[PDB]
Amino acid sequence: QEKIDRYQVDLEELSYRLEEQTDVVEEAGELQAEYEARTEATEQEVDELKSQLADYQQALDVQQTRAIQYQQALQALERARELCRLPDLSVDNAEEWLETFQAKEQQATEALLALEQKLSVADAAHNQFEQAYQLVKNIVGETSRSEA
């Protein structure tokens, strides 16, 4: 019996280890996919430059488009520094504030979700609040509705 107890502890241990390794593998695959996408984009861009140099008749149309995209990216960055009110901001570290405000939005959404449940159950008519209140009062004696 004592041996079984030890086995149980061991299995709990391995459960926790499995949880952690599952997590780690998840982030590792996430990073792997991210770098896969990035390497793919880099090589595609390399190929585009190869075509541009080979097809120099391209006539900087792609260059014009990229310059316009650059201007638009600049404009978007300024707009975000405004909305987020983060003059201290760069493309490299904007990811950190993005995940930060993702957590922020998660907090806001979870709050408002609890709020939504409370408002939904607030549909209970006036009579229920009373009946509960006087029931509590009769059982304990006078108590405040907030404390009820």
Next chain:
Amino acid sequence: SQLADYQQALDVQQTRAIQYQQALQALERARELCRLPDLSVDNAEEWLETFQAKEQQATEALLALEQKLSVADAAHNQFEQAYQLVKNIVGETSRSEA
């Protein structure tokens, strides 16, 4: 590389004269993409601002849908969490019995 080398002399002297065609294709591409056959580079600014208005309206509607979507999916998530807690404590059971 060999094509680049061969065309080197060909494309260098562009004379900024074959440049405006790119504007022509851009205008035509917009004409198909934007259901504005009358779209002219002159009146294209009114269309630009109007489509920007539509786009920002679309973003706003998207964000409202997103707010409700987020609250809803999170609510479903707590629903699921309650279900898992129930199954762990007791085992299989329907959500109605939960």
Next chain:
Amino acid sequence: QQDYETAKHSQHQAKQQAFALVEIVQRRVHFSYSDSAGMLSENADLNDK
């Protein structure tokens, strides 16, 4: 979620159209000298092959 997906599609299309209009605005200048012309198709054959 279905509705929001549709809204996202519509938003993307609106953005693309807005960008095309921006492109027209930018290339109005290049349109300005549309009367210009230049030599072409000197070594096209071998380049094409």
Next chain:
Amino acid sequence: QQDYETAKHSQHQAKQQAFALVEIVQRRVHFSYSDSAGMLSENADLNDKLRQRLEHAESDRSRAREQLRQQQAQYSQFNQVLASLKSSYETKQDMLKEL
């Protein structure tokens, strides 16, 4: 209700800010077009700058490739260790049933 409309507006603020940051994340590459923007301003022969940019892209691509390879090896490592935990747990749990 008043508090909830206020929280709703706060959620809206978070939504718009997150959306903007996402947009710039999308435009990450476009900021690399700063070279393209300067390259476009040449308005003359600029194949040399194109070749320089292509070489830089080649270096970046090779760096990304190595990064991907080493990340792949790391991920595989994590995979095998996780599988080993799986096997160990299976065996221990089997022995638990048997006992």
